[PDB]
Amino acid sequence: MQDAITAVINNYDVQGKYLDGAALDKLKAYFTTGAVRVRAAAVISSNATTIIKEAAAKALIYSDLTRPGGNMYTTRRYAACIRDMDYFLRYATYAMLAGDPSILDERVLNGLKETYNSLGVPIAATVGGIQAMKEVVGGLVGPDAAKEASIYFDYLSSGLS
Amino acid sequence: MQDAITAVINNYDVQGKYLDGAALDKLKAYFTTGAVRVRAAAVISSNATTIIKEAAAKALIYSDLTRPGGNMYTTRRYAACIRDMDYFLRYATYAMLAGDPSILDERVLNGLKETYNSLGVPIAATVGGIQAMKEVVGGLVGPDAAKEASIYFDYLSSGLS
Amino acid sequence: MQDAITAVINNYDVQGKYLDGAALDKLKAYFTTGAVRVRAAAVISSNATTIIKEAAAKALIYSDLTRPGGNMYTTRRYAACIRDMDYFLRYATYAMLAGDPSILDERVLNGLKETYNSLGVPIAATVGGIQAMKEVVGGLVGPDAAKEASIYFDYLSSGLS
Amino acid sequence: QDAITAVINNYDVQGKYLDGAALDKLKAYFTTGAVRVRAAAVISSNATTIIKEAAAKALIYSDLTRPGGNMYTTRRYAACIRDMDYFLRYATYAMLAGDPSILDERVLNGLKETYNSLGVPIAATVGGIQAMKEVVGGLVGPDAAKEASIYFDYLSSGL
Amino acid sequence: SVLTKAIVNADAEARYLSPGELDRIKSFVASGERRLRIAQTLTEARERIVKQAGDQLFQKRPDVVSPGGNAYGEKMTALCLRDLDYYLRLVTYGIVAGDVTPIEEIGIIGVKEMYNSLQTPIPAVAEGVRAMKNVATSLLSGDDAAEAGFYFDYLVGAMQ
Amino acid sequence: SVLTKAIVNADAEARYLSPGELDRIKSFVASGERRLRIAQTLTEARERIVKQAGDQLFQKRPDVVSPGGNAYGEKMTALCLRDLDYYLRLVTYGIVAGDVTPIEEIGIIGVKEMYNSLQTPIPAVAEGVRAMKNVATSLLSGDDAAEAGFYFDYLVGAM
Amino acid sequence: VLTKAIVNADAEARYLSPGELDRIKSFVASGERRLRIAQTLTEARERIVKQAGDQLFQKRPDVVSPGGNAYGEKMTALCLRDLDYYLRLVTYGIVAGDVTPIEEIGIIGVKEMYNSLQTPIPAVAEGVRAMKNVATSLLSGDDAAEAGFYFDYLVGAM
Amino acid sequence: SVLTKAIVNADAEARYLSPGELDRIKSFVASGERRLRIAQTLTEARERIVKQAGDQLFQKRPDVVSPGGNAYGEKMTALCLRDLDYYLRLVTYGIVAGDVTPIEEIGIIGVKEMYNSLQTPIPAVAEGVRAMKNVATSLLSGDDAAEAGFYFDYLVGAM
Amino acid sequence: SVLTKAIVNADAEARYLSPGELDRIKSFVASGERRLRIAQTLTEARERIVKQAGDQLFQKRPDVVSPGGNAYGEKMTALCLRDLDYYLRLVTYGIVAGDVTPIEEIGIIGVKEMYNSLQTPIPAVAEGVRAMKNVATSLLSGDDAAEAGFYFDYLVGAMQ
Amino acid sequence: GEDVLPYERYLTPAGLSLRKGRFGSSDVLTTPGGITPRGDAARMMDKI
Ligand SMILES: *[C@H](C)[C@H]1/C(=C/c2[nH]c(/C=C3N=C(/C=C4\NC(=O)C(CC)=C4C)C(C)=C\3CCC(=O)O)c(CCC(=O)O)c2C)NC(=O)[C@@H]1C
Ligand SMILES: *[C@H](C)[C@H]1/C(=C/c2[nH]c(/C=C3N=C(/C=C4\NC(=O)C(CC)=C4C)C(C)=C\3CCC(=O)O)c(CCC(=O)O)c2C)NC(=O)[C@@H]1C
Ligand SMILES: *[C@H](C)[C@H]1/C(=C/c2[nH]c(/C=C3N=C(/C=C4\NC(=O)C(CC)=C4C)C(C)=C\3CCC(=O)O)c(CCC(=O)O)c2C)NC(=O)[C@@H]1C
């Protein structure tokens, strides 16, 4: 994966340039944002189970999906869906700390569409769930953190769709 | 493409053998089936629009696909999907008249899987639609014709999957 | 894989319906056929080597295939072809006991066409061999069993072709 | 192996075809069989309790369970009761079979060495097996108890 | 099902079905007709079994149907009863199959995880299944009840 | 075949088969059984047709079987007869197909180029085919002969 | 049969299921009938072997020919002794209710043994088939079906 | 959007953006704030616009919500209203973009084909859009209404 | 049935069945096998016939399924369809019997009075039967359709 | 772990489609909160 600090380094390395003040400023910018990000991440980790619960309640459950003939019908499928939700949450948290969307592309986004199509999992419903998680997360993290958190959630959603 | 009559001829030609009674019997078998096939083809052509409508209703429409973020969402994509359905129907009809699956391989089947994967069209859903068309077609054509019609539909389905 | 009993169950489970008389009738039908199938399977297992021998004699051997430049020329290729024949026989027997064609799709039929095309094995000759095995099997099993046995052999043949 | 196979094997080494005398031994086993099946069902249903009672008699309220004892810590406690269950299950298998051989082949072979490396106390384990036997004897009832007891004793002697 | 299991073992070994395996298949097909009747009985009595079991469960566990409890409220109580009904349907499927596999795939894998997200207490669910067993046993004849009991016990064992 | 041709035209137009096209297919399937018999007749008489035609050709063209000529010598004469046999087999295929397309792919495309490299005279080959037609016509009934003639004529036209 | 059930249970690490136990009960009841079937074949053993041998030799002249393995008195006796061995194994199988007894004594390493001897395996199979036909005739139909299964297994193994 | 269109024309010509083109971009960015307000107004009133338009449409066309008609039944009537909602959302997108292109891609290409498969009458759909326009116009101020009208008219023209 | 009718006439006259009467019985028994097939066809297509006819009727008469109308509401609409199903069953009975008498006793006597109490419009009911006839005719072969038509027409004639 | 012999743990999506895809997807791929008419007509006939 890549993070903001490494991104700056890599750009300089391809140029072969030693680190310069302009580069330092970009790094400095990240460092200020960092403290906020760490606080947000801790909030998400503690409330992860609840975030998933709330989001599922908002979109997935009490629906045709959970009813027989629906994708999330049967215990095994239900458990799989909530496991997937957790993945999305954990990776988004990783991305938020990193300050880079690349990890999402390298781990989550790559081959997901194809996997889902073979499985028969409904992509639009999954996207709906991700959006729901974003809304719940936004509340817990608070406004400044929410903007940063939202972009990664949206990135996942756009990739899947 | 190839047809049943030509297939027999080609097999003999590679052997270099003159046509023999056993070969003639296969040709004769085709000739009896022919009349039924012609009737079936006319039925399908007249009811093609309805067949597609019914099949879509059975599988595609009223689903995640049609909902926003689904593959068949937006008018353009919806129109594309029904165009593809029509292709499958037309080719299956051609194959049924021919009595040979080869045309399906040469035109429809070759490279479709790869195209669909790049596009992100869901193959299993498409296969579902093909199976639905088969069921509708079976009714209209009647039982004797249905068996013949079914094999080509199944051939398409197996190729895609 | 799936079997007849499980197939009924699965269809009902997706509907969410409790088992009903119509469903019960299908199950009951299977149960009556069961005893015959077990006897047929034992017959096939005991005569498997001979069945393959007879079928090969009918189609494969004394032919261009066995002659130099033919697909089944050389000991290694000959051995491979009879191994494939055995596979088909064993799987058909499994399917007959199960009362469902699914196992054939899951193990034998998946990717076989593509494998054969890369290898340059001739599909029509293989199909011919399968049909020959069916005829031999029909004799040994006896008439009631033969009808049941035939459908699975035909299923394999249709898949390959 | 089993009583039926034991008879067969004895005849096979002689090369003799099965005879009436042999048949009588087989018949003897068949009569005992019904009792054995009933006993096995009783044991399976009461297995958890049998282990509990036996543990209460020997294992618990002891130095073993107290800190510094072999069965101290949850992990070790769980291991000991798992071992007890093994002995019970295998004895039940042996009782149905009518032969002690399975005990030798699976349970008895290498157990002493394993236990010595582990530092598990053999005498305490033997005590537990004997305790289980007593509890089992009650539940199965007298006719079944005699048959059940021999396999328990066999395990104890091996250990 | 019994038959699926036998076939699968054979395929792994890459051999035709063994005589012993074939014999088990024979036994199963003979048993099937009796099994069908047992399943049919429970299906007909399904509505009453669920109702009776529910009442027993609620008496055993007042808390679940209490303002704090998950089951409390009409909507929630219905869902709890629906769950009991689901498990009964699975049990019937099991009896006809002759194996717990049908039950297991639909109901026992990931069950812990699902209920933990829901926050439903697993032990209470187990009690409800036990309650259903008792009701079902009464309607069934003794030998039939024993067969049904095994499947019921498995469920209870799976869920703790 | 007739049917292949119809399907191909439809696919190019990207339309379902026209009623008229369908009617032609119907007519063809009815005709097929008669066509099969015509083909069968020629197959049985094949050996004699080739032999008779060969003789006629050599009488018509002394030069081809002369020291200068390509056909001259046993090996060469055999090859010339083999060619005649090939064309007859193609004609039979055509009759059953109801179209010249099968004939055309195997025999008529690049034929000029092949023979020019060989240096075989194309007109002589045509005469041989004409000769075969006359022999074949005699064995066939008049209406059957007319059907067969069309395919024979096409070959002569092609070369 | 009992051994088989126990072994499956041990693999699963569980006590025997009631259904499994019921099958054991059925087997012990069936055993007495099975013993009678075995007894019948034992009494007819000498004739079964003799008849089967003759059939085999008619079916395969070559085996009892100067080139063939079976040829000569000593060799012919050995061939018949082998047929007798297989019959004894079949009887053991019927009483056991399983092929395992048969399998251990006769079917594992059989190919290797016969290849060293140079005896043709297909001929041996034919002899077993022949024995089956003779045995079937003496047995009652239901008894014959039971016996047939064991005979078929041997033929399949060889 | 306006900007995309300008860039695309420049790229085709392979030139930097012309002064005139740049001026149009400037005008658009100034207009945008006004456009945003117009869009916001319609979004807030969306629920009522759809409801009012639906009623008008059903009064104008009794048939569509009749046993023969496509719209008939609660499920179907909901879908018809959902469609109206979709078109309104598209119109709002158009206003902010300043171009019909956003509207056109999502809603107007393949629309005929989709509705023909559904068997929905296209003219009725057009009437619904007209109805929505009238409701929307009333809430909007006159100048705002004119801007909104253009997008509404385009939709009506497209269907 | 035809046979019943003949017997009844004979009993009134207190005589054995006349040769003419016997001849009619002979004709009927020959016809019966054909009639059975016609009836079987309609029975299989029953569900679809009712559904299609209902839709046609509702299109023809919007009012009946309108807030004022009797048929309006799911419960009422089901009852209207049930009535159509009843009449179809009666028609099948008629075809096998070879006379309208079976139909007549169950459905046509007192029909006016029953519907008037219910307040159901009789003409609408007639239209529904006509609709069912058209659907049934399409599935039946022409000669079969003519036979079926007679029974359908009788119903329509009875109800006005 | 020295006593189990290796078995097939995972497989790729394309491999999975080969085995299961013949006959495609059964299901309509239901979504949450969708208006659907599916099953309605059957329910009406069951009532009648
Ligand atoms: C001769 C010493 C022994 C003998 C020979 C025998 N062979 C056949 C039949 C076949 N033989 C072959 C073998 C080969 N095919 C290969 O590709 C190779 C390597 C290049 C070999 C050696 C094949 C393919 C056949 C099958 C038929 C065919 O040729 O297509 C027979 C006839 C078998 C029958 O029963 O039909 C025989 C008799 N048999 C002996 O007993 C001799 C000691
Ligand atoms: C108290 C909160 C609850 C309770 C406790 C209870 N425990 C026992 C008996 C035992 N508990 C243990 C536990 C441990 N051994 C260990 O090694 C560890 C971890 C270091 C633990 C926690 C053991 C071994 C025993 C057995 C007694 C012994 O020391 O040998 C009892 C007695 C049960 C009896 O009489 O059989 C009780 C009551 N029970 C409750 O109801 C409370 C909620
Ligand atoms: C009743 C004994 C207990 C109880 C149950 C309860 N369940 C829910 C909600 C759901 N339960 C399920 C369970 C299943 N779905 C499946 O696919 C299967 C296997 C076939 C099962 C068993 C599901 C999916 C739900 C989620 C909601 C939905 O219907 O989609 C609830 C209420 C929801 C909530 O917890 O808020 C309840 C109450 N509750 C108890 O306490 C009883 C012990």
Ligand SMILES: *[C@H](C)[C@H]1/C(=C/c2[nH]c(/C=C3N=C(/C=C4\NC(=O)C(CC)=C4C)C(C)=C\3CCC(=O)O)c(CCC(=O)O)c2C)NC(=O)[C@@H]1C
């Ligand atoms: C209402 C004014 C008219 C009407 C509407 C109507 N629509 C449907 C069904 C669908 N309509 C759509 C349309 C869209 N999907 C898109 O992607 C877009 C652009 C964003 C549009 C406008 C779709 C996809 C459907 C299919 C069903 C689905 O949602 O999956 C119906 C019912 C379909 C049926 O015939 O059963 C109706 C009634 N019908 C009228 O008569 C009104 C005039």
